[PDB]
Design an enzyme around this catalytic site. Structure first.
Site, mmCIF file in Angstrom:
data_model
loop_
_atom_site.group_PDB
_atom_site.id
_atom_site.type_symbol
_atom_site.label_atom_id
_atom_site.label_comp_id
_atom_site.label_asym_id
_atom_site.label_seq_id
_atom_site.Cartn_x
_atom_site.Cartn_y
_atom_site.Cartn_z
ATOM 1 N N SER A 176 0.808 -1.214 0.000
ATOM 2 C CA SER A 176 0.000 0.000 0.000
ATOM 3 C C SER A 176 0.846 1.271 0.000
ATOM 4 C CB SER A 176 -0.934 0.016 1.222
ATOM 5 O OG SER A 176 -1.810 -1.101 1.227
ATOM 6 N N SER A 199 2.382 -7.161 1.504
ATOM 7 C CA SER A 199 1.261 -6.504 2.146
ATOM 8 C C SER A 199 -0.017 -6.621 1.298
ATOM 9 C CB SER A 199 1.678 -5.051 2.396
ATOM 10 O OG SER A 199 0.832 -4.423 3.324
ATOM 11 N N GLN A 200 -0.622 -5.498 0.905
ATOM 12 C CA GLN A 200 -1.826 -5.565 0.069
ATOM 13 C C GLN A 200 -1.495 -6.357 -1.208
ATOM 14 O OE1 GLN A 200 -5.101 -2.952 -2.491
ATOM 15 N NE2 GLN A 200 -3.999 -1.870 -0.837
ATOM 16 N N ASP A 253 4.276 -8.694 13.378
ATOM 17 C CA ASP A 253 3.609 -8.070 12.229
ATOM 18 C C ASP A 253 2.140 -8.472 12.376
ATOM 19 O OD1 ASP A 253 2.568 -7.063 9.872
ATOM 20 O OD2 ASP A 253 4.029 -8.061 8.553
ATOM 21 N N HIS A 267 6.168 -4.823 10.208
ATOM 22 C CA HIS A 267 5.598 -4.904 8.854
ATOM 23 C C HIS A 267 6.506 -4.236 7.829
ATOM 24 C CE1 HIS A 267 2.455 -5.700 5.995
ATOM 25 N NE2 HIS A 267 2.200 -4.428 5.742
#
EC number: 3.1.1.74
Length: 197
Positions: free
Chosen positions: A26, A104-105, A159, A172
């Site tokens: 993101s 992540s995303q 995380d 993260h």
């Protein structure tokens, strides 16, 4: 650097043997973000610049933070975009071995895309790496319809996204070392397992 469109720009008459499709996290820049370039450099060292095409997921994938909250952990538009890249790879270079990754995303996007992929294409992805996998708990550390032996998940202690939350904590943002070593090591090993060397 942060933007690579080797597949889109690539000449069909001179297909690379390996094609890597990667989705950024993101708010990250270009189509590779913070981790993609490190993976890219190492893949190039192993297969040569002409031996591997690095393709980030751009276009409709805006990597909007809010989309993490959507059902699949990303937007429908983004999944469409990544599916289209796998389809383009399969069409442009039918004999190339594919590898994928996401952060992540982007990890949720990668998992969603691969899950929806035509099995004939999915079966061509020799290995997939996921960092800070937002659907790690929900999916029990797997990518639906994809073998565990071809999957490698990097989820750091602390995380929170790996533990069913959407809170962004310091761990993260600590995947740099992983992207520089074990991630590309895994990808190279999986490609050589099927292509030999």
């Amino acid at each position: 650097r942060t933007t690579r469109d080797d597949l889109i720009n690539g000449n069909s008459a001179s297909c690379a043997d390996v094609i890597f499709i990667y989705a950024r996290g993101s708010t990250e820049t270009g189509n590779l973000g913070t981790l993609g370039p490190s993976i890219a450099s190492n893949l190039e060292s192993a297969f040569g610049k002409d031996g591997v095409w690095i393709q980030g997921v751009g276009g409709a994938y805006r990597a909007t933070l809010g989309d993490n909250a959507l059902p699949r952990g990303t937007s429908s538009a983004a999944i469409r975009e990544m599916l289209g890249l796998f389809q383009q790879a399969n069409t442009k270079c039918p004999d190339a071995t594919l590898i994928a990754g996401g952060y992540s995303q982007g990890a949720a996007l990668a998992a969603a895309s691969i899950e929806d992929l035509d099995s004939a294409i999915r079966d061509k992805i020799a290995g997939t790496v996921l960092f800070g996998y937002t659907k790690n708990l929900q999916n029990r550390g797997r990518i639906p319809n994809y073998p565990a032996d071809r999957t490698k998940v990097f989820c750091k202690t602390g995380d929170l996204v790996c533990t069913g939350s959407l809170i962004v904590a310091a761990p993260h943002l600590a995947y740099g070392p992983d992207a520089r070593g074990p991630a590309p090591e895994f990808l190279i090993e999986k490609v050589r397992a099927v292509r030999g060397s």
